[PDB]
Amino acid sequence: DLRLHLLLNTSVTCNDGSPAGYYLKESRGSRRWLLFLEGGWYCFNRENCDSRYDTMRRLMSSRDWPRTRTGTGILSSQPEENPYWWNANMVFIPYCSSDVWSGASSKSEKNEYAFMGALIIQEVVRELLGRGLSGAKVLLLAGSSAGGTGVLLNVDRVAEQLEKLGYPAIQVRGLADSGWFLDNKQYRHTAPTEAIRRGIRYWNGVVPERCRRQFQEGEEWNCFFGYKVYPTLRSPVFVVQWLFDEAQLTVDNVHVQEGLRLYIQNLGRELRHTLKDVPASFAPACLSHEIIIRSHWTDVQVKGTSLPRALHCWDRSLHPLKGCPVHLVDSCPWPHCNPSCPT
Numbered sequence: 001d002l003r004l005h006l007l008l009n010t011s012v013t014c015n016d017g018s019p020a021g022y023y024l025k026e027s028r029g030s031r032r033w034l035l036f037l038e039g040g041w042y043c044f045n046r047e048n049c050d051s052r053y054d055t056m057r058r059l060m061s062s063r064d065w066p067r068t069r070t071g072t073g074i075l076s077s078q079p080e081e082n083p084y085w086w087n088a089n090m091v092f093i094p095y096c097s098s099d100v101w102s103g104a105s106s107k108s109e110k111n112e113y114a115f116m117g118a119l120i121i122q123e124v125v126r127e128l129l130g131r132g133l134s135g136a137k138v139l140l141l142a143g144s145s146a147g148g149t150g151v152l153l154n155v156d157r158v159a160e161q162l163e164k165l166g167y168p169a170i171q172v173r174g175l176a177d178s179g180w181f182l183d184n185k186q187y188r189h190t191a192p193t194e195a196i197r198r199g200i201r202y203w204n205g206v207v208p209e210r211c212r213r214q215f216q217e218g219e220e221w222n223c224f225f226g227y228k229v230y231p232t233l234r235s236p237v238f239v240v241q242w243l244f245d246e247a248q249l250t251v252d253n254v255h256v257q258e259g260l261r262l263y264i265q266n267l268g269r270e271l272r273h274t275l276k277d278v279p280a281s282f283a284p285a286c287l288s289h290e291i292i293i294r295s296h297w298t299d300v301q302v303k304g305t306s307l308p309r310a311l312h313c314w315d316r317s318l319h320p321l322k323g324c325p326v327h328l329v330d331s332c333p334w335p336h337c338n339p340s341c342p343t
């Protein structure tokens with residue numbers, strides 16, 4: 001079980017001004033630290049943030065969080081469930097900022113909600129150094145869905161924060177699960193681009209520095225898209241992405257005749273193309289959403305290699321390897337052409 005700590009700096013808050021926090025399970029003598037960013041969509045204006053506060057309040061407030069959480073999947077401490085990092089220090093960072101982990105804006109007289117995702121991550125990293133993170137060799141910043149995109153937006157800032165804090169020996173790495181999206185055309189029109197452009201303004205959202213310098217003012221929304229932000233990042237990042245992600249299909253208004261068949265097959269081919277130059281990646285041809293904190297995340301395989309194995313091989317490469325691949329992208333063109341897809 002992971003134990004809740006609310007942030008001692010209570011100026012770093014969830015949407016409604018309640019303190020943000022993290023769940024921690026320490027593993028003595030391990031120098032590996034896994035900080036996992038929860039996902040759960042976002043809200044981009046007052047009206048739809050008000051709606052989310054009614055029916056998704058735990059994603060906007062710590063007032064009702066439980067004292068504990070069970071670590072599952074890559075957060076499990078049992079080798080049977082987590083062959084990769086079962087002995088690591090485990091941190092689960094609840095998503096309570098509704099900003100894809102990009103915000104740095106306090107709740108004030110002019111803002112009904114605080115959007116502080118990017119500062120929550122920094123504050124968690126700050127307060128953990130006193131609980132053992134100072135001795136770490138590896139800090140793996142992981143995340144699923146909106147949290148996977150949050151890895152891409154924050155991993156280099158976590159590295160820079162630890163460098164200027166005097167810890168250049170901590171190797172910061174990223175693991176982005178189901179946060180690698182395409183700014184593509186919808187199957188039936190009316191869409192992520194405009195929602196993110198409004199979100200960034202509404203949140204005062206911040207993006208990684210080099211990506212921001214390429215796309216410049218007014219165009220920061222581009223850096224929320226994995227295939228655009230990833231080549232600008234310095235930290236090593238492992239990308240896990242279903243070829244037919246359910247959240248991708250949702251925003252594409254896909255819920256089978258030729259037109260839809262071609263649209264789906266072209267989507268999978270476009271996703272494969274954006275991953276061709278990502279050296280550490282795991283991308284199975286399944287219709288699904290998230291994987292790394294699911295208890296049965298050991299079950300899926302690409303070209304006969306599981307995700308926990310691919311992650312271990314990635315570890316080794318950061319010391320090609322024989323029989324230990326790190327780039328695993330399905331080539332088959334339709335959901336569940338991979339037989340190990342989740343049922």
Ligand SMILES: O=C(O)CCCCc1cccc2ccccc12
Binds near residue numbers: 042146196
């Ligand atoms: O958090 C979840 O479960 C949903 C997935 C994350 C939100 C999201 C959905 C669709 C497209 C996106 C594009 C960029 C960032 C985020 C995008």
Ligand SMILES: *[C@@H]1O[C@H](CO)[C@@H](O)[C@H](O)[C@H]1NC(C)=O
Binds near residue numbers: 009011012123
């Ligand atoms: C608390 O967090 C805010 C936001 O990052 C920061 O401006 C302030 O310096 C922090 N205070 C302390 C005591 O850490």
